């Protein structure tokens, strides 16, 4: 007879019906990506449309209950994302236009081919095509062609479409009582009604511009080291004084710098750590790799994974008889059912991605006690943070020796950790400034901070200022650089690739403090210590029922998100580049331009 009892009863009819349909829908998607077939493609389409209709019905039904009368935080959290109108705020023409626009977004991206009209042989696909020539190239113009030419057509046919995209989504957000779409993407770190833990959306920029300011030193030395190394490859192209060419950063955009390591090794003569040589002679396979990662999780208290998981997940490619998209992803079908999509191969990386997904698996299986709407990451960067630390404990030599994969007489020296942390920072430290830039750019564009004529001049002006790379040749306003990314074209949030980074280091620091690890943090490990696993599981079962500041408190003890764990992690590395840069130029100047003639 009261609004709060009615809301709870509605939530029971919701969670008792929504899971039965989402289970069926996720089953259809899993079946389609297991059997790439025109029979399968319509199955997960109608499965998704059924759930899209059901959630729209529940969204228009749940708005009758006011949120100003509810006092239970769980019910308020459940109703908050459900009473959100979503795309229904717009007119029918606007809705159809936005769906068509989005359908065109990734259409141009995926079906965007590159070819040379004068060189028929200079034709190649994207994966394992276009990415390859950006991944293993030592030539300058061989990268210039595949870099400009990629956004020559794809980076142009998205400029006005993206202009329409931004103005439709601005009205998408504004009709939601939001300032801009950037303030809608900051909408899930938003917390209301919690005293001392209330998290305003605008505080994200305050946190981000602050936390980046202490990374900026270490990243400046890392950029200086890579530049001081790079004239070995391009002595006639790059000024050691100026910034870097963007086409020489490892791939199409520069997100990951991982493939830069092979030429910028700190110590080449040191035999790199390698177990790729060691499973092959040990007769290891996909089943054993997952069984072994299971012992890693069990050692810290994370329990034995379900029986049906093994009978229903796929680990090896099922040959040619059918096609299966096997990007690294872990699937939560719900209802206690969990299957993993992995093209497993005998290599550390595929072992490391197996562990990274294993983190997703046992994180996801914990909050089955949480309601359906709450069965999600505590925040958007919170899932690719929890499932990655456990990989960082799989690639440690102390772990590899504990399992016998590495040599029992394998020596680790002052030149070993430098190579290891350089490889990791070229993956984890180089990605942070570009995640920060991309989302800052999205925020200053959704705010309308920029007019059309400066929709790109500042972009290059700002990446010449934040990351420290210049353009070998300029672009005009007709171009559209950031849309070339998958997460920009397909309208995804990218800052989950910044926040996860500074979440996982806090997690690993807290856990190897709980394990009472004595030594540098990069050698920390979590295995064979139940006291850190039990600490992690207490947060892990929360899901989203509590806010992310309190989730950070539960493991680390701080509501804020900090850089201190990351700088402590790379302190052995940081001191090293302090020694290596006694003669190099720290800092950059934007006035330099390689085409400035």
Curated annotation (Swiss-Prot):
Substitution effect: residue 1 to P: Increases slightly the interaction with RBD domain of SARS-CoV-2 spike protein
Disulfide bridge partners, by residue number: 115-123, 326-343, 512-524
Positions annotated to bind Zn(2+): 356, 360, 384
Modification after translation (UniProt): N-glycosylation on Asn-72 may limit SARS infectivity. Proteolytic cleavage by ADAM17 generates a secreted form. Also cleaved by serine proteases: TMPRSS2, TMPRSS11D and HPN/TMPRSS1.
UniProt effect for mutating residue 58 to T: Increases slightly the interaction with RBD domain of SARS-CoV-2 spike protein
Residues where chloride binds: 151, 459, 463
Annotated consequence of substituting residue 92 to P: No effect on interaction with SARS-CoV spike glycoprotein
Tissues in which the protein is found: Expressed in endothelial cells from small and large arteries, and in arterial smooth muscle cells (at protein level). Expressed in enterocytes of the small intestine, Leydig cells and Sertoli cells (at protein level). Expressed in the renal proximal tubule and the small intestine (at protein level). Expressed in heart, kidney, testis, and gastrointestinal system (at protein level). In lung, expressed at low levels in some alveolar type 2 cells, the expression seems to be individual-specific (at protein level). Expressed in nasal epithelial cells (at protein level).
Result of altering residue 174 to D: No effect on interaction with SARS-CoV spike glycoprotein
Side Extracellular, residues: 1-597
Effect annotated for changing residue 54 to Y: Increases slightly the interaction with RBD domain of SARS-CoV-2 spike protein
Catalytic activity, EC: 3.4.17.23, 3.4.17.-
Annotated effect of mutating residue 19 to A: No effect on interaction with SARS-CoV spike glycoprotein
Activity sensitivity to pH: Optimum pH is 6.5 in the presence of 1 M NaCl. Active from pH 6 to 9.
Glycosylated residues, chain numbering: 35, 72, 85, 304, 414, 528
One GO biological process term: regulation of cell population proliferation
Active site: residue positions: 357, 487
Outcome recorded upon mutating residue 13 to D: Abolishes interaction with SARS-CoV spike glycoprotein
Role: Essential counter-regulatory carboxypeptidase of the renin-angiotensin hormone system that is a critical regulator of blood volume, systemic vascular resistance, and thus cardiovascular homeostasis. Converts angiotensin I to angiotensin 1-9, a nine-amino acid peptide with anti-hypertrophic effects in cardiomyocytes, and angiotensin II to angiotensin 1-7, which then acts as a beneficial vasodilator and anti-proliferation agent, counterbalancing the actions of the vasoconstrictor angiotensin II. (Microbial infection) Acts as a receptor for human coronaviruses SARS-CoV and SARS-CoV-2, as well as human coronavirus NL63/HCoV-NL63.
Protein family according to the UniProt entry: Belongs to the peptidase M2 family.
Protein name from the UniProt record: Angiotensin-converting enzyme 2
Gene: ACE2
Part of the intact protein present: 19 to 615 of 805
């Amino acid at each position: 007879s009261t609004i709060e009892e009615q809301a709870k009863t509605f939530l029971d009819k919701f969670n008792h019906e929504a899971e039965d349909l989402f289970y069926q829908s996720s089953l259809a998607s899993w079946n389609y990506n297991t059997n790439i077939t025109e029979e399968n493609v319509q199955n997960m389409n109608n499965a998704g449309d059924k759930w899209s209709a059901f959630l729209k019905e529940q969204s228009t039904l749940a708005q009758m209950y006011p949120l100003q009368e509810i006092q239970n935080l769980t019910v308020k959290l459940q109703l908050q994302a459900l009473q959100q109108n979503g795309s229904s705020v717009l007119s029918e023409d606007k809705s159809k236009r936005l769906n068509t626009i989005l359908n065109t977004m990734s259409t141009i991206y995926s079906t965007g081919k590159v070819c040379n009209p004068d060189n028929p042989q200079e034709c190649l696909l994207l994966e394992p095509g276009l990415n390859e020539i950006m991944a293993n190239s030592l030539d300058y113009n061989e990268r210039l062609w595949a870099w400009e030419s990629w956004r020559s057509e794809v980076g142009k046919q998205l400029r006005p479409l993206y202009e329409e995209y931004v103005v439709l989504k601005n009205e998408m957000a504004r009709a939601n009582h939001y300032e801009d779409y950037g303030d809608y993407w900051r909408g899930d770190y938003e917390v209301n009604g919690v005293d001392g833990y209330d998290y305003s959306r605008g505080q994200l920029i305050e946190d981000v511009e602050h936390t980046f300011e202490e990374i900026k030193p270490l990243y400046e030395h890392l950029h200086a080291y890579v530049r001081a190394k790079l004239m070995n490859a391009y002595p006639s192209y790059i000024s050691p004084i100026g910034c870097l060419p963007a086409h020489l950063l490892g791939d199409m955009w520069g997100r990951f710098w991982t493939n830069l390591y092979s030429l910028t090794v700190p110590f080449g003569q040191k035999p790199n750590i390698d177990v790729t040589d060691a499973m092959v002679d040990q007769a290891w396979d996909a089943q054993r790799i997952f069984k072994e990662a299971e012992k890693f999780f069990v050692s810290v208290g994370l329990p034995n994974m379900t029986q049906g998981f093994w009978e229903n997940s796929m680990l090896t490619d099922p040959g040619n008889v059918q096609k299966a998209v096997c990007h690294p992803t872990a699937w939560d079908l719900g209802k206690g059912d969990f299957r993993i999509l992995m093209c497993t191969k005998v290599t550390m990386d595929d072992f490391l991605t197996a562990h990274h997904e294993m983190g997703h698996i046992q994180y996801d299986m914990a909050y089955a006690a949480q309601p359906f709407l709450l069965r999600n990451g505590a925040n958007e960067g919170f899932h690719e943070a929890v499932g990655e630390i456990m990989s960082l404990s799989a690639a440690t030599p102390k772990h590899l020796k504990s399992i016998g994969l590495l040599s029992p007489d394998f020596q680790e020296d002052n030149e070993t950790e430098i190579n290891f942390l350089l490889k990791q920072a070229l993956t984890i430290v180089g990605t942070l400034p570009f995640t920060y830039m991309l989302e800052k750019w999205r925020w200053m564009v959704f705010k309308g901070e920029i007019p059309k004529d400066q929709w790109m001049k500042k972009w290059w002006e700002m990446k010449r200022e934040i990351v420290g790379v210049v353009e070998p040749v300029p672009h005009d306003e007709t171009y559209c650089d950031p849309a070339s990314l998958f997460h920009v074209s397909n309208d995804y949030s990218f800052i989950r690739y910044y926040t996860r980074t500074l979440y996982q280091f806090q997690f690993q620091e807290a856990l190897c403090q709980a394990a009472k690890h004595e030594g540098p943090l990069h050698k920390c490990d979590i295995s064979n210590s139940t006291e850190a696993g039990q600490k992690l599981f207490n947060m892990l079962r929360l899901g989203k029922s509590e806010p992310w500041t309190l989730a950070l408190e539960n493991v680390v003890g701080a509501k804020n998100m900090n850089v201190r764990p990351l700088l402590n992690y790379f302190e052995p590395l940081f001191t090293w580049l302090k020694d290596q840069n006694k003669n190099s130029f720290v800092g950059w100047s934007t006035d330099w331009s390689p085409y400035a003639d």
